[PDB]
Ligand binder design. Sequence first.
Ligand SMILES: *[C@@H]1O[C@H](CO)[C@@H](O)[C@H](O)[C@H]1NC(C)=O
Lengths: 23, 48
Amino acid sequence: EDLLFNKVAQKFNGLTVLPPLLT
Amino acid sequence: DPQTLEILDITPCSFGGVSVITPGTNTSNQVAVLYQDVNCTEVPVAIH
Ligand SMILES: *[C@@H]1O[C@H](CO)[C@@H](O)[C@H](O)[C@H]1NC(C)=O
């Protein structure tokens, strides 16, 4: 799972990036 | 700056959404308010 995570909230003109419920 | 020649960032002043967490209206009339993507240092300064 470490390889799969190392192989793959920005303010802008009204754009929002909500976080996922399950971290 | 057209005088001192300093490099100044430009960051938009916080916006976001407001979400009301309701226990129910059939259970209680209390609410909690979520200010998304906003530091609490800036929540009280707003209109309405
Ligand atoms: C939010 O405000 C607190 C109070 O100064 C600060 O310590 C924290 O770094 C701020 N959060 C961000 C993401 O800047």
